[PDB]
Amino acid sequence: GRLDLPPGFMFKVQAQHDYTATDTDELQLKAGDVVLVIPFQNPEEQDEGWLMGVKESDWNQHKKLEKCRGVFPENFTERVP
Numbered sequence: 001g002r003l004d005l006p007p008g009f010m011f012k013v014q015a016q017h018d019y020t021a022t023d024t025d026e027l028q029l030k031a032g033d034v035v036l037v038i039p040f041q042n043p044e045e046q047d048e049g050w051l052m053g054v055k056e057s058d059w060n061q062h063k064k065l066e067k068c069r070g071v072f073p074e075n076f077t078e079r080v081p
Contacts, residue, residue, distance in 0.1 A: 001060030008039035012080040013053065019076050027053060027070025034080070035072060038065075049075050 040052030058068035
């Protein structure tokens with residue numbers, strides 16, 4: 001996939017449910033998905049219980065992550081050590 005990693009990135013997470021998100025910049029998660037926790041552009045754009053993360057596949061497009069950026073409920077996902 002990508003050659004470089006996203007700056008500010010935190011870690012990889014694993015969804016535990018299928019949350020269909022349909023927005024202009026939402027993050028669709030599927031029960032058993034892989035998403036990376038990254039620092040959004042601002043916390044004022046983040047919701048309560050939802051953070052800015054990108055899917056594993058999207059990572060491959062890290063080249064244009066700026067267009068892969070999305071949001072997802074952390075309480076609906078799990079942290080991957």
